[PDB]
Subunit: 190 residues, 6 copies
């Protein structure tokens, strides 16, 4: 087995109960524990805040579909050359939208991915928040509204981009390894 | 003198907010004399507010190999690289206060390579900057370099975490037009 | 059926004998025709020279294994954000290496791929020929030689990088589309 | 004499005949042999594939003029800091255009070269293909059309950019040295 | 005390009297001698050429206000990450505009400083000369004219940018330290 | 005849006597007037300080030969893509060095110019001051000392680089044209 982190990966039995429950609850749904859970459990207080933030953005009722949210995470993680997040969320993207080819395209060159203008423009904003938020101006929000987004959708695209930047940096810094399961998941329909 | 807007987004009234959030805002006010705008602007999305400050507290309030000033120093250099006006200005004030060095935050914001800091701290910021702009390139030699200056790998995680979270903060700050309070600009400049 | 080129694509019948002969040869071996053949057959003389150059590099006897050559292609194409070549050779790399996870790693961040230092080094060089060839110097070759390569291997790396650099630009310019087959090919072992 | 490559340079004596032929042919219609032939003759198969592709682009009847083809090479090569190609095709550019100053301009900053907006628009594309092809969209082909180019012309511009990127990377990697003759050629009408 | 330069700082008594008078003139004007004077005096011919040029740009009567000229310096100095110039001219900018916040805003992100569109356009052009002067075209001048800048004002902007680009590089090369006084100057209005 | 500036070029009869004198002294010397003189004449106060700085550096006696000084200008100009300075000073460089090929080499890729390690090392420091002076450190000076350059020689390199970048920006902003004479000058010896 290849190491999943550069840092100590604690034993499920050594972890506090609430952390342990979130990990098991994810194993139940997924069938395995994604390595982000295990690797970030090295620092319990950060694990708690990381997933709290994650949930607040990814589980909320919002203008962005669950698929679109993961698509944001894939395009921005590509930009940061983040192995784990590209691979982990590429799979989920494929599942959530039932499009086996789309995550690959968004990761290699989203400019040429088989997605609609509304989504392309969604990502354009995400890439700007990612690499150059200092230049975010009113024309940027106008561009999103031209496609039916509200400014609250803008905040949403921005917040996902922001938080998965936190996550890409942590994953790259510790060499967080994507589970084998993610590499094939969502590629074969039905 | 009508005040400048602090966000391009709505700012809720302290009264129209959850008591837990209201209490955190009052605790910071009753200890600073004013409410930093990050609390009021993020209070537009209460669940994100709670998750932000909890993450913030986990890194900036823990016991650790980094001093309180050093942690703020990391924020200032990384924020300066992202050209985050709120963060550079807000955390420069706090850096000056913690270090008791009125000049250090401006040096770190403009070019930390010439800041009045020891090579241990310059090394710490070299790493922070790598995580900040090229984390995918982080390797074992980057950890070795920090260790050469007396850091442990647990300290290396603290640096990287702070960089990571304020890269989030920066991005939100910049997207919403988060405006630094007037008090930060002058705070810590007079010994 | 999405289009595979921004330019006209000719009918196999329409093409010269040797071109159709080369295309039939691959149709039979693979069970389909990669789009690169069809889309470049729009300009018969360039097709001829493109594939002659390709064969001279990828079919020669040499110090790089077939899978190492494809590895060079995935890492440099990722650099040029070439959807066609990343996806296409990504599949081919998985076949030759019998490693289903490697092509994704090489395409996203080859610095974290599951490859030995000799292969990392081979890629470090390729990446310099790709993005900064004017800086290539004697110490670059000396670095390779310390990993066991010969100067003739180094040329091979450089040459693959040069040629696929050409291919990336043609692919990208015309929006050459990777075949659906390539996205799953090599991910489930035989 | 300075070395023309960091790699071995075969003797014409020991080369396949078809390769000697094109070298000895160059020696007549030029009086000397550009180092690109001799340096790439180290690998005969690559030599053959390389010149065929070159001839396929540069010698075809097409929408771009001979001089315009060279102008694309000089500008893209200049962007890849390719000493060999900038200098060698700067010369040929001067010979075709009969304009001794144009290559230098195209090499330093084509944006200020003495050329009409049509040729500048063309080179704007060439430089997009050169450094950011993944971003090439319909608006780029539309831009060229406004100056009277067709999409076939765009392909030719892109293919020249693509090929000389190969040529540049090879030059740069082996230290291919421009012949002395190229530095002065075409500077006197 | 911290050294103000990597190089020797000549004593007054040792300097040519004309050079000594400019230094003593500013001592009276400011109440201290900015380290630019003291440190460049190491090379008297250059001190003369330098301050002559400075005065030709910053003392001329012309299109740009005195605060506007300082704004160009701080924003362009911020982009060459010049510690000395950013800090020194930020101080002056605060005084001339009577706006204690505007310098830090211009230094970090002029796009978000409290300045009219005219001043933003001005600095857009300054930053183009500063980082990409080779791309300066007629559309650049056209944009400026829309805000009230003549071609002679555009020259002034470019000229300031260019000269302070020289200044930044000497400051940066020698470690030209800013005077303690500039850090606090202009923050509490008179 | 192509315009030599985007701005007015004054007639020498219309200029101050000292300015007309300098302009006729160079004509005496060169047999033509470099367009830098005529175009900057548009601003006599700046013309004076500009040529006063130029002389302070280019005419001084110091550790750099006259050729090496031009070589710094051509390498750094080239990096600012300054048509005027590259072409003009390339010509001068050919003269001073009696090396017809050397300026082209330095202009395109100095890393491959026919120059010894000492000169390559002087240009490495020049390009650093040119594009990243904020990162100049004690090790860059040490690198120059190993090649025999003194503290004052380093200042000369840094100073020429700084001043010619002011020149590049000004040439670039006004579309300063180089004279037909510089294009062929020095390419043929004796």
């Amino acid at each position: 087995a290849h190491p999943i982190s550069r840092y100590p990966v604690p034993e499920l039995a050594a972890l506090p109960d609430d952390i342990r429950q979130r990990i098991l609850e994810v194993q139940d749904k997924a069938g395995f524990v994604p390595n982000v859970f295990l690797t970030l459990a090295h620092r319990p207080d950060e694990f708690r805040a990381f997933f709290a933030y994650h949930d607040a953005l990814m589980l909320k009722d919002g203008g962005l579909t669950k698929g679109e949210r993961e698509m944001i995470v894939v395009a921005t993680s590509a930009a940061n050359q983040c192995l784990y997040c590209v691979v982990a969320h590429g799979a989920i993207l494929r599942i959530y939208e039932k499009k086996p080819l789309v995550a690959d395209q968004v990761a290699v060159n989203y400019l040429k991915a088989d997605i609609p203008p509304r989504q392309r423009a969604m990502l354009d904003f995400a890439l700007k928040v990612c690499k150059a938020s200092h230049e975010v101006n009113e024309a940027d929000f106008e561009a999103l509204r031209e496609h039916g987004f509200t400014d609250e959708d803008a905040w949403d695209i921005a917040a996902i981009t922001a938080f998965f930047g936190l996550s890409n940096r942590m994953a790259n810094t510790i060499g967080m390894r994507p589970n084998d399961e993610f590499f094939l998941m969502g590629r074969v329909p039905k």
